[PDB]
Design a protein around this ligand. Structure first.
Ligand SMILES: [Mg+2]
Length: 210
């Protein structure tokens, strides 16, 4: 009869080792420029949505096959599946909320056995990226809105939620969460975290969760 907890994870650099957008940028020949903007966005120096639309536009015309080649290089962070299975083993609900893309996130949702997955989407036409991106994980308070929505669906009080993030777009998720864990995170998020983990193994979060 114990109560369930809801645990939300950020995708890029948290559940997986890579930054999806930077990997696709490599295939489009704009890795350096995109990497730089990604770093500023995660450090909180830029509005997230404007920074993402700017990086995605540099991907215009990339064939879908090259997008997949970049996605295939994405690997799960050390300890990811074991950690998710242990949380589910306790009866907890687990979700991934990402400013990244369904094309990468959908895969990991099934691979790791997550209950919820929210991400943006790359627009495609004639088998190539158009350079646009649309979705519900763009606005500054988007992740916090999703955390509240999932918690309501599950009947779980916000005090019983845990957010694990690593970038500035995880700040709104931290505002609503009962426990805030910064996983090998940028300074702007570490300032706001309850706990900061710097060892790159997702199982390290289990020590802090009953
Ligand atoms: Mg991240």
């Amino acid at each position: 009869e114990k109560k369930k907890k809801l645990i939300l994870f950020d995708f890029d650099s948290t559940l997986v080792n890579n930054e999806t957008i930077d990997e696709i940028a490599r295939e489009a020949g704009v890795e350096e420029e995109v990497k730089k903007i990604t770093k500023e966005a995660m450090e909180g120096k830029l509005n997230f949505e404007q920074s993402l639309r700017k990086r995605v536009s540099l991907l215009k015309d990339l064939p879908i096959e090259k997008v997949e080649k970049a996605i295939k290089r994405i690997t799960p962070t050390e300890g990811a599946e074991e950690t998710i299975k242990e949380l589910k083993n306790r009866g907890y609900v687990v979700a991934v909320v990402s400013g990244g893309f369904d094309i990468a996130v959908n895969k990991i949702k099934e691979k790791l056995g997550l209950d919820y997955a929210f991400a943006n989407r790359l627009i495609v036409k004639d088998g190539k990226l158009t350079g646009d991106v649309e979705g519900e994980v763009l606005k500054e308070n988007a992740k916090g809105e999703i955390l509240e929505k999932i918690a309501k669906i599950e009947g779980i009080n916000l005090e019983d939620t845990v957010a694990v993030g690593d970038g500035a777009n995880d700040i709104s998720m931290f505002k609503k969460a009962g426990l805030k864990i910064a996983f090998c995170a940028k300074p702007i998020l570490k300032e706001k975290a309850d706990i900061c983990i710097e060892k790159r193994d997702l199982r390290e979060i289990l020590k802090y969760i009953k």
